[PDB]
Amino acid sequence: MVLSEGEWQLVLHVWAKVEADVAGHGQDILIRLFKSHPETLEKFDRFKHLKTEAEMKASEDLKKHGVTVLTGLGAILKKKGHHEAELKPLAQSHATKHKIPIKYLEFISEAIIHVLHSRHPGDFGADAQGAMNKALELFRKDIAAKYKELGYQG
Numbered sequence: 715m716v717l718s719e720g721e722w723q724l725v726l727h728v729w730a731k732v733e734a735d736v737a738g739h740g741q742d743i744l745i746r747l748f749k750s751h752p753e754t755l756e757k758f759d760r761f762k763h764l765k766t767e768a769e770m771k772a773s774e775d776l777k778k779h780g781v782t783v784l785t786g787l788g789a790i791l792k793k794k795g796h797h798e799a800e801l802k803p804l805a806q807s808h809a810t811k812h813k814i815p816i817k818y819l820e821f822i823s824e825a826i827i828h829v830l831h832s833r834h835p836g837d838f839g840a841d842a843q844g845a846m847n848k849a850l851e852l853f854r855k856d857i858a859a860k861y862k863e864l865g866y867q868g
């Protein structure tokens with residue numbers, strides 16, 4: 715995977731917008747994920763009992779997790795591919811502690827793209843979506859590499 719500097723700038727430009735409302739984007743993304751793929755909700759004992767979108771929107775645990783996810787992802791994206799230091803811990807944790815399959819990472823990537831488009835349609839066009847897709851694909855491929863290294867067939 716390789717993005718042009720221009721593509722990385724499209725990614726960082728839209729992320730600056732995500733940063734103006736991290737919690738809101740986080741909620742939208744996780745709600746999208748849980749509604750699109752209900753099985754992923756089973757991984758959170760703290761709010762796996764959430765059912766309606768109203769319950770999800772009112773959940774402090776869901777909101778907090780969305781902030782954790784986007785804060786971590788933002789740190790990785792800003793490295794423009796040179797994210798070994800930030801990605802290693804995330805990978806090991808997801809493989810040995812959380813046991814998150816690669817397919818789940820694919821699902822959340824879909825949700826991220828969808829929400830960014832929904833909230834920033836005037837700027838998150840085909841070029842930016844393509845760039846973010848490549849960025850998240852690189853992210854997933856590098857996580858998969860760490861997984862395989864530790865024997866976790868996620």
Ligand SMILES: Cc1cccc(/C=N/c2ccccc2/N=C/c2cccc(C)c2O)c1O
Nearest residue numbers: 754757782783784786787812814818819822
């Ligand atoms: C993508 C991403 C970027 C930055 C940080 C994270 C943090 N993930 C977690 C942190 C603590 C505990 C659990 C985490 N992830 C759980 C999880 C559950 C279902 C589906 C997916 C897909 C998950 O990553 C993250 O998942």
Ligand SMILES: [Fe+3]
Nearest residue numbers: 783808812814
């Ligand atoms: Fe996670």
